[PDB]
């Protein structure tokens, strides 16, 4: 099974540095080319850099946008691909996908998010959305408000509750801090019997908060 696992992404100030890793497995890493391809919401997909085989004197190529700042390198011994990013800007923000080229086609990794901002890591505060009093079916949730950067993950009852859950995409507020809401529909017969808890995890700041939602 061909696998490509990116690493190293995260928050960095403008002008800072970052080096992404890519663990390859499932194929002979020394025999095929490698490349990095990033993606932004506003510009879409954009090729970044590429590195050839040892046979080709490790010939590298870069997109004109990142020339002089990014360096692509491979380590056949460790079966990993690296992308050193220096003097980061704004258009460098986005998910960075690791690629390998079998000539006939290419394969992609899960990608790693790279955010370039002036702001520091802010831990979210969790607030409950108490249920009301549609007849038999009720709704409740948690409001994850004021955090940065993305992302935040939300589960319910430590993953024991997955049916009827809806976690909404975060929305950037006037403050520059992200906000996200997670709700679930449940039978109203259980509001007083079942404990409903949301497990918010904002890994960029280590804010693993558990807030049980009670009816007011």
């Amino acid at each position: 099974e061909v696998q490509l696992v990116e690493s190293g992404g995260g928050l960095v100030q403008p002008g800072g540095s970052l080096r992404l890793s890519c663990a390859a497995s499932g194929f002979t890493f020394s025999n095929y080319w490698m490349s990095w391809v990033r993606q932004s919401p506003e510009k879409g997909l954009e090729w970044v850099s590429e590195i050839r085989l040892r046979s080709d004197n490790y010939a590298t190529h870069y997109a004109e946008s990142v020339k002089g700042r990014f360096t692509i390198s491979r380590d056949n011994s460790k079966n990993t691909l690296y992308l050193q990013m220096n003097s980061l800007r704004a258009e460098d923000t986005g998910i960075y996908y690791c690629r390998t080229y079998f000539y006939s086609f290419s394969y992609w990794g899960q990608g790693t998010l790279v955010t370039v901002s002036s702001a520091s890591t802010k831990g979210p505060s969790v607030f409950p959305l108490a249920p009301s009093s549609s007849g038999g079916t009720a709704a409740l949730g948690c409001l994850v408000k004021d955090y940065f950067p993305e992302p935040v993950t939300v589960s319910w009852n430590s993953g024991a509750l997955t049916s009827g859950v809806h976690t909404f995409p975060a929305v950037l507020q006037s403050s520059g801090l992200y906000s996200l809401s997670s709700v679930v529909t449940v039978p109203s017969s259980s509001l007083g019997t079942q404990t409903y808890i949301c497990n918010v995890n904002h890994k960029p700041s280590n804010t693993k908060v558990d807030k049980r939602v009670e009816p007011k």
Binding site: G44, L45, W47, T137, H166
Partner: protein, 218 residues
Amino acid sequence: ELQMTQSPSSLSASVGDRVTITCRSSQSLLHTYGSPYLNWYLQKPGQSPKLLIYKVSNRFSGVPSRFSGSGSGTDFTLTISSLQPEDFAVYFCSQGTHLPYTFGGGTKVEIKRTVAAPSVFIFPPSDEQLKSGTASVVCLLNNFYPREAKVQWKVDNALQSGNSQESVTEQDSKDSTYSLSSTLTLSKADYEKHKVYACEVTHQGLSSPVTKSFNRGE
């Protein structure tokens, strides 16, 4: 560069319809590096792109048979014989044989279904929240397929103008429905300055604009 214009930019088709997506390679370099061998992908929200067709026509190993890529000269066409519920994603053409590698604009494919009316819920602001110095009330719309929805916030029937934000979930892979959450944020003083809070939801699946209200303090 190797520009490619993808058509259309968006589409909605019922499960079972035939769909055709077109990419036009650049006439600038149909004579510089010959006719290109395009690759087709689809990308789910938050996942890596999945290869469908490589080298114009070849179907990648494991891809379902309903996908097919044709093309001659500079017009290339990915074809889905009959859409499927899991086929909602962003499709785009790729060209990774001549530098710099370029990609298509993309095509967001939505799944058609019957008009579904949303269930509305309103939530007051938390008690442990207002003690920080800000109040935000949330209105919920659950499971509907006329994604075009309208939600007016009112405080004492005073239509709000620019203190609310919406966010819509991706199309549900179970019933092809959407869900929306409008969050109205205002000061704590402004919260206890009034008492009635309502969101007026106008919608295609509703005969009468629904209004879910609640007065401050029970």
